[PDB]
Enzyme design. Structure first.
Site, short mmCIF file in Angstrom:
data_model
loop_
_atom_site.label_atom_id
_atom_site.label_comp_id
_atom_site.label_asym_id
_atom_site.label_seq_id
_atom_site.Cartn_x
_atom_site.Cartn_y
_atom_site.Cartn_z
N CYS B 106 8.09 4.11 3.18
CA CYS B 106 8.36 3.16 3.27
C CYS B 106 8.76 2.92 4.79
CB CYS B 106 9.83 2.29 2.24
SG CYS B 106 10.53 1.08 2.66
N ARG B 109 13.04 1.70 5.89
CA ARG B 109 14.01 1.97 4.64
C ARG B 109 15.59 2.49 5.69
NH1 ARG B 109 12.31 7.81 3.46
NH2 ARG B 109 10.67 7.15 4.96
N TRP B 278 10.97 -8.51 3.17
CA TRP B 278 10.32 -9.39 4.09
C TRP B 278 8.92 -7.96 4.42
CZ3 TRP B 278 15.44 -7.49 5.41
CH2 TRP B 278 15.99 -7.10 6.53
N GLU B 283 0.25 -6.07 7.65
CA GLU B 283 0.62 -6.15 6.30
C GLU B 283 -0.27 -6.76 5.31
OE1 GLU B 283 3.86 -4.53 2.85
OE2 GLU B 283 5.32 -5.73 4.64
#
Ligand code: HEM
Ligand code: HEM
Ligand SMILES: Cc1ccnc(CCCCCO[C@H]2CNC[C@H]2Cc2cc(C)cc(N)n2)c1
Ligand SMILES: Cc1ccnc(CCCCCO[C@H]2CNC[C@H]2Cc2cc(C)cc(N)n2)c1
Ligand SMILES: C[C@H](O)[C@H](O)[C@H]1CNc2nc(N)[nH]c(=O)c2N1
Ligand SMILES: C[C@H](O)[C@H](O)[C@H]1CNc2nc(N)[nH]c(=O)c2N1
Ligand SMILES: [Zn+2]
Lengths: 411, 407
Positions: B106, B109, B278, B283
């Site tokens: 991720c 973070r 979000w 992506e």
């Protein structure tokens, strides 16, 4: 053991058995993956096993495994090692060895070409002047007026580690970098320290933005010596853009011949500390890294400025826009000049075909995903979606310390 | 055992001590790196619980205190007597934040401590699950000003009574295989869409049909629910300079909400723990839109731009990719729906990683996932060496429930 790799775009699954021939270590453990770490004097003892293992491979490749020729050669190498503490490769073994080190190079996306490699045996070389001559012939042969041909030149192997041949340049052709009193850099910032060493050794630096560096050559463990590659042998390409006429006025050029000169070639336990090799570029090596890394020529701002992009906020993707245009310009320029170059779409597509063929005929293809995926447009290339297994096969190319850190100066 | 990571752009060198607390195994060995592989009783439960409570009590600066000891004793008694135990609310909140802090894949973070935790351990039916989820969706969406959240349903008991959200994300579009042979909508969702239809869903058979939730409570057969349409915030996609872009008819949803993972805290397993933040623009613009096996729109966009598509070396794909990603970011910004571009996100992740090295002694990071899928090397994460290792509490991937479920 069988390990499977999936491609998440095609659902093609491959089975690797070749990793079972790995012995060298990765850097990773059960508890920690070091896959994105850049960097994760032999006696008779270790040597005959390495020799035997290499020679068994060689003799299998030529379908002579177990033959008299095979057995006599083991015998011969065995006795050479006891009597002299090392051994000499036959030409055919050296060629096979150098080909396989490339085939085994898990960070190389260009390996579809591995079996087409011109090998220049320079093991009779004794002086830096001899090395210079060898390297000029390599550069000329490999350049071939733009129609690039892969090649490697192999200088005498390591003996006691006190008599090493080394090319001190990281690549045969690179541009000088000069750190200015105000903290800026003129030319290539990646080459500042090496340029300083050249100057200290007596190079008369022109102090421009694209000064081809002199070769600095160490033979038989002696102090290295400076030589200028003949300018007529250095093919260069001025960079222009197909639509933008102002692109040429940025003053950019690059050389055509990428030639790694700082690596160690290991074949059958023997160490070739000077084994410069060359191929041709993938466009992104120049257009993304050489031009657009912040620690390199760093041209993104000036390009986006000329394109009048909205530079106020990163989310205008101004950097991504300038980045594509620069890479279009590099491919266009090389192509218009008839200098071999491959784009990252074509290079990655060829690599996937190569990798699949290798799984089928060899049982695997070690591959370092971190390096194989291009530094722009990662997921629209087929390698992004490809699972890969990275492990170390010999023969191999290895990183070695920069020689200025280890060289004992004689005076 | 005491490791260094280097950033090759900045020469900044960080020392990792946190990997010593590494627990699970990576997939790698000394012989084979598997860095690029997508998927690499009362006895065991007490060590797992102690390891967690120790780090909890240490985080609140009461390590070795009477309160620490008493709780460890309390939990111990509960396991021997009941075969499992219950987390205090504070332990659950702490555990959920840390599973996010520990998520090595991720990039977002830096936000890990600002997470709204919804304790749904009191839920008993699928209907209850649906109610909790709508509330999550609405809280997190916040009319476009997105807020990170997780909703945690009851922990696994004997494995025969699992809570699962069958969807992989709370909000996704349907996929239908056509008589044509092509796929309508999102090709990644064909199998699940067929399960929905098999279970009763009346599919609109369009290109952007929000899937129904398929919810499993107490290990029962799952049931279908439609998220109220007014709770699903969507963004129509236009380009700031290409007038024709809107005519592609593209939209995406605002709330990315992963719902298939397992949250492990102190050895307890929360098999249904949907969470949301979000989006980073890529992506949607790179993966959702341009992946060959997803909406696969590069060709059509390249065409409307009238690019030279005869040869790959015109870089038409790269050109079109950039414009699609500009259009995504622009659209979200125009409609005031939170989004972050990949430059800004990776810059924050580099700052987060430095805080973590300084304050915690490391930060596990999977470079293969952290580096954006476009423009890799112009983002700072590209030049940043990372160490990947597995800390608990953790989010884990788990088998699709339809392969596991006895009907
Ligand atoms: C035919 C043309 C070739 C192409 C297009 C090609 C492509 C590339 C590229 C893009 C890289 C990564 C370089 C970087 O990002 O800095 C690379 C790495 C590498 N290649 Fe090739 N390659 C070619 C030929 C060769 C040849 C002839 C050899 C040696 C025989 C070779 C051996 C290596 C090795 C050892 C690496 C890793 C270098 C390092 O660790 O710094 N390649 N290749
Ligand atoms: C606040 C905004 C956030 C951003 C910008 C963000 C960014 C991302 C991105 C870009 C990915 C890669 C996903 C993919 O490529 O499919 C990812 C993965 C992931 N994130 Fe986040 N994240 C956010 C919030 C969260 C939250 C709230 C959690 C949990 C509480 C979380 C946990 C995870 C996990 C476990 C993964 C890996 C998922 C998998 O393996 O499939 N993230 N993140
Ligand atoms: C033969 C060929 C064909 C196509 N392209 C090439 C270019 C390779 C150029 C290599 C330049 O790479 C430089 C710049 N960054 C890492 C460094 C090489 C390197 C550095 C380190 C620390 C380790 C390692 N294995 N390799 C060579
Ligand atoms: C919370 C948040 C914030 C920002 N973005 C997101 C989106 C993540 C969406 C998850 C999509 O991932 C899907 C599609 N490709 C891999 C798959 C997830 C996955 C698959 C597998 C096989 C293993 C694994 N660990 N994770 C979520
Ligand atoms: C830290 C990281 O491993 C480093 O930046 C790598 C990433 N991938 C790369 N890939 C290639 N081809 N060349 C490189 O120099 C690098 N650098
Ligand atoms: C094979 C490889 O692991 C796979 O394509 C990965 C690469 N990096 C990724 N990175 C992110 N963030 N998300 C992904 O889905 C993937 N896919
Ligand atoms: Zn690894």
């Amino acid at each position: 053991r069988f390990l499977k790799v999936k491609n998440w775009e095609t659902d093609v699954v491959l089975t690797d058995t070749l990793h079972l021939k790995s012995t060298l270590e990765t850097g990773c453990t059960e508890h920690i993956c070091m896959g994105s770490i850049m960097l994760p004097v032999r006696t008779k003892d270790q040597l005959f096993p390495l020799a035997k293992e290499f020679l068994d491979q060689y003799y299998s490749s030529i379908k002579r495994f177990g033959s008299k020729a095979h057995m006599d050669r083991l015998e011969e190498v065995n006795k050479e090692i006891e009597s002299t503490s090392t051994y000499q490769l036959k030409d055919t073994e050296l060629i096979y060895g150098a080909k396989h080190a490339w085939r085994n190079a898990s960070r190389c996306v260009g390996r579809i070409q591995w079996s087409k490699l011109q090998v220049f045996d320079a093991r009779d070389c004794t002086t830096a002047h001899g090395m210079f001559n060898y390297i000029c012939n390599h550069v000329k042969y490999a350049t071939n007026k733009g129609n690039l041909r892969s090649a490697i030149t192999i200088f005498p192997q390591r003996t006691d580690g006190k008599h090493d041949f080394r090319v001190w340049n990281s690549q045969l052709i690179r541009y000088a970098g000069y750190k200015q009193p105000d903290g800026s850099t003129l030319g290539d910032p990646a080459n500042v320290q090496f340029t300083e060493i050249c100057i200290q050794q007596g190079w008369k630096a022109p102090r421009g933005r694209f000064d081809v560096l002199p070769l600095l050559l160490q033979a038989n463990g002696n102090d290295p010596e400076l030589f200028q590659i003949p300018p007529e042998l250095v093919l260069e390409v001025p960079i222009r853009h197909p639509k933008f006429d102002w692109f040429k006025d940025l003053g950019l050029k690059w050389y055509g011949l990428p030639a790694v000169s700082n690596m160690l070639l290991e074949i059958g336990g023997l160490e070739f500390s000077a084994c410069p090799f060359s191929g041709w570029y993938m466009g992104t090596e120049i257009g993304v890294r050489d031009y657009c890394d912040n620690s390199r020529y760093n041209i993104l701002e000036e390009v986006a400025k000329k394109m009048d992009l909205d530079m106020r906020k990163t989310s205008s993707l101004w950097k991504d826009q300038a980045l594509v245009e620069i890479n279009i310009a590099v491919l266009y320029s090389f192509q218009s000049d008839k200098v071999t170059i491959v784009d990252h779409h074509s290079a990655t597509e060829s690599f996937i075909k190569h990798m699949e063929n290798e799984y089928r005929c060899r049982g695997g293809c070690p591959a370092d995903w971190v390096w194989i995926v291009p530094p722009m447009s990662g997921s629209i290339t087929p390698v992004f979606h490809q699972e890969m297994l990275n492990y170390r096969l010999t023969p191999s190319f290895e990183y070695q310390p920069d020689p200025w850190n280890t060289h004992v100066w004689k005076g």
